[PDB]
Amino acid sequence: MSLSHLTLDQYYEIQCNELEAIRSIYMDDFTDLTKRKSSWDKQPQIIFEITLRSVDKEPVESSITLHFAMTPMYPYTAPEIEFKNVQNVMDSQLQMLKSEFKKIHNTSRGQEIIFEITSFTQEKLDEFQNVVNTQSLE
Template identity: 25%
Template sequence: MSSEDIQEQQDNEFEALKAIYVDDVRDLRNSAWNIWHPLKFSLTLTPQQGSTDEANARVDLLVTCSDRYPFEVPQLGICNEKGISKEEAQLLLKGLQKEAQKHVGNAMVFDLSMYVQEFLFEHRKPSETSFYEQMIQRQQQQQLKEQAKLDQEASKCLFFFRKMQFKSVK
């Protein structure tokens, strides 16, 4: 494949990523003098869309491609991790490198981003609720307890009322 074909493939992949991830993609290439450079960008990723606690976990995936990408695995990095430990971030990076090997010869960044999102979904930590949310939860629990107590008392009263009715019928 010619260098022009590789450039076009990298540019097309980057445009597709920008269309999918919009503001979460940042081009890190030095584009002075309008000279083409291989892909170098960061992509902010959260757990899979539609999952609960989506924003509780997040990482920036750093991708640096050579002028031979996609026929070489790009350099990958993880930074600004939130909601996962450093050890989990290292585990994610190792998994990403293995995943990238499977896609050599093809555009792979979208597949790698999906891998990251799945990883974040599986390893995210539950979000901590604010004091206000905790207070509301306690109030709701207290209301439920009070309602259960009232229901129990009403049930007792109904039982005695029916018992009295039954005695008066005899």
């Protein structure tokens, strides 16, 4: 309807702030996937991946990788999240987080959501290992 005053370039500042903001939390638990590796800069979108997992190793480690993508419209638009590795977790936990991603974004519609999504998944994930519907041998 009205797109001129603030160009997409403005969103770059907000997106970049999330990288440095989260980087401080996962200084080591951070993964670089942007088109920067090796080269200096090509078609980077700021997007980045973060390593997540339970708090302990027993009964499992529940390790999952959350990759968030800051669309060229965000926060105007909604980013993209995808789980990787997924060992202990089967899928119920993965899909469960996706549903919560809607509530988090709705409340953070305009602000940082990388920390919210990571915290929500981390908190819920850790609590899982403690109380998970064990079954063994599917």
